[PDB]
Amino acid sequence: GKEVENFEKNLEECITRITNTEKCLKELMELKTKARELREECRSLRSRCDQLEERVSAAEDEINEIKREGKFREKRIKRNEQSLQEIWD
Amino acid sequence: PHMSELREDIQTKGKEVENFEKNLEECITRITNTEKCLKELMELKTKARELREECRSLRSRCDQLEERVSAAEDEINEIKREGKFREKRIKRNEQSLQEIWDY
Amino acid sequence: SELREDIQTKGKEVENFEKNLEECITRITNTEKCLKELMELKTKARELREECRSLRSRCDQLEERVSAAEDEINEIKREGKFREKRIKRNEQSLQEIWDY
Ligand SMILES: [Cl-]
Ligand SMILES: [Cl-]
């Protein structure tokens, strides 16, 4: 047969092209799970940054308080140095 | 009559061959459209690999920041302790001076 | 007739191919449903790209802030060393006054 041979060839190409397509979808189905994992990886990093930001803000506030206290203690140390300047050589 | 018997088999098998061809064309079209999308979705395999590495990098950056913040917190706590101790000493010196003036 | 027999046999052959073609069309329909489902991943990957872009800028900012905090702590420690020297001198002066 001349035309039957032409159809068998086209059908074989069809089956082959469909089979190759089905293999790719099975491969791409894994990306659904990998995307779920990455979504959770980002969720975790966002909470780690949330915590770091709180800690850094608290540290900044502590540094500002320490600086202010030290300035006012130095005022008192200088006063004490001047008082002793009047008394002991 | 034997012409009509013949015309019928020619038309029957012709209609079957035409329906086949139209259906094969639909098949090829549907397959071609499907192949275009998979080529497009194959890029996501590489993009997911890049994102995995991007997260791996950010986790190590957070690991380092957490160590640095913990060290800074420890230093602040020690500084606060030292300042509390020095405050006790400044107050004692203030009282000693007042005792000299009141003498 | 030999010819009428081959005309019917090649006709039978095409009906068998039509059945196979129908199996194919069903297999392509199932495949098309999956691609529509996987098209959502294109958007999800775009969202994740942006999520990482945001986290990188948050880390950039934290690193600057932590470096600035570290510098401030080092300066405070250095100033405390000098204040300690002064308190100790004042304590020694007072001990000398009260021992006199
Ligand atoms: Cl201090
Ligand atoms: Cl003092």
Q: Cβ contacts of residue A61 below 8 Å, gap of 6+?
A: none
User: Cα separation of C100 and C98, whole Å?
Assistant: 5
Q: Cβ contacts of residue B92 below 8 Å, gap of 6+?
A: C91
Kindly determine whether residue B68 and residue C73, on different chains, have CB atoms separated by under 8 Å.
no
Q: Burial of A42 by CB count in 10 Å (0-12 exposed, 13-18 middle, 19+ buried)?
A: buried
What SS3 class is residue C51?
Answer: helix
Cβ of C63: how many Cβ atoms within 10 Å? 14
Closest among A57, A51, A76, A71 to B76, alpha carbons compared? A57
Kindly determine whether residue B86 and residue C91, on different chains, have CB atoms separated by under 8 Å.
no
Q: Burial of C52 by CB count in 10 Å (0-12 exposed, 13-18 middle, 19+ buried)?
A: buried
First-last CA distance in chain B: 150
User: Cα separation of B38 and B33, whole Å?
Assistant: 9
Closest among A32, A21, B23, A17 to C30, alpha carbons compared? A21
Closest among C47, C24, B40 to A25, alpha carbons compared? B40
Whether chain C has a CB inside 8 Å of the CB on A62: the answer is no
Taking contacts as CB-CB distances below 8 angstroms, the residues of chain B near C24 are 27
Do residues C32 and B31 make contact, with C-beta atoms less than 8 angstroms apart?
A: no
Chain C, residues 22-61, CB within 8 A of chain A, namely 24, 27-28, 31, 34-35, 38, 41, 44-45, 48, 51-52, 55, 58-59
Kindly determine whether residue B20 and residue C21, on different chains, have CB atoms separated by under 8 Å.
yes
Closest among B85, B92, B102 to C95, alpha carbons compared? B92
* Ligand 1 center from residue A58 Cα (angstroms): 19
- Domain span at B19: 4-103
> Angle at Cα C70 formed by Cα C85 and Cα A65, nearest 5°?
65
User: Cα separation of B14 and B7, whole Å?
Assistant: 10
* CB neighbour burial string for B20-41, b if at least 16 within 10 angstroms, e if fewer: beebbeebeebbeebeebbeeb
* Ligand 1 center from residue B83 Cα (angstroms): 5
| Residue A89 distance to chain B (closest CA, Å) | 15
Experimental method: X-ray
Tokens of A8: 């068998």
* Resolution, expressed in angstroms to one decimal: 2.7
| Torsion angle, alpha carbons of B10, B12, B18, B22, to 10 | 180
CA C68 to chain centre: 28
Q: Cβ contacts of residue B96 below 8 Å, gap of 6+?
A: C94, C97, C98
Q: What are phi and psi of B35, to 5 degrees?
A: -65, -35
| Residue B69 distance to chain C (closest CA, Å) | 7
What is the total count of domains within chain B?
Answer: 1
DSSP conformation letters of C56-85: HHHHHHHHHHHHHHHHHHHHHHHHHHHHHH
Most A CBs within 10 Å, among B24, B75, B91, to test the A interface: B24
